[PDB]
Amino acid sequence: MRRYEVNIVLNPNLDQSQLALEKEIIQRAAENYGARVEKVEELGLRRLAYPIAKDPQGYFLWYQVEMPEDRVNDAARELRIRDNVRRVMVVKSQEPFL
Numbered sequence: 001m002r003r004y005e006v007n008i009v010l011n012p013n014l015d016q017s018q019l020a021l022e023k024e025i026i027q028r029a030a031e032n033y034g035a036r037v038e039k040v041e042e043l044g045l046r047r048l049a050y051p052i053a054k055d056p057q058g059y060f061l062w063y064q065v066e067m068p069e070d071r072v073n074d075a076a077r078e079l080r081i082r083d084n085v086r087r088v089m090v091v092k093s094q095e096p097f098l
Contacts, residue, residue, distance in 0.1 A: 001066050001068060001069075002069045002072075003038075003065070003066045003092070003093040004064075004066075004072065004091060004093055005062065005063070005064055006030070006062070006064075006065060006088070006090050007061075007089040007090070008026060008060070008061040008062075008087070009048070009058035009059070009060055009061075009085070009086045009088075010022060010085060011055075011059070011083075011084040012055055013055075014084060018084075022085075023040070025082075026061070026063075027063070029075065030065060030067070032075075033068075033074060033075040034067050034068050035065040035075070036067065037063055037064075037065050038064045038066065038097070040061070040062070040063050040064075041061070042059075042061055043062055044060060045057055045058070045059055046060050052086040053086060055086070058086055058087065064096060072090060076088050
């Protein structure tokens with residue numbers, strides 16, 4: 001098993017209600033690949049390094065998880081193709097939250 005930090009950028013035009021639903025779905029999708037979600041955090045609106053879908057902004061979500069390294073890529077794929085997800089970045093944890 002390995003601990004990873006999952007950075008998700010969502011459509012900045014969603015409202016509180018829709019964000020909550022995407023946030024839940026994403027968590028259930030992750031758990032579906034054998035991941036245990038240790039922490040979730042909504043970072044909010046940020047200015048992207050570069051526009052995605054003609055949008056220079058994005059709503060950032062963050063997850064800390066532990067899961068089989070073998071299923072990570074598959075999970076990233078399913079996430080990358082969701083309509084409201086603009087960017088997915090998975091990195092090995094360096095200083096995990098307690």
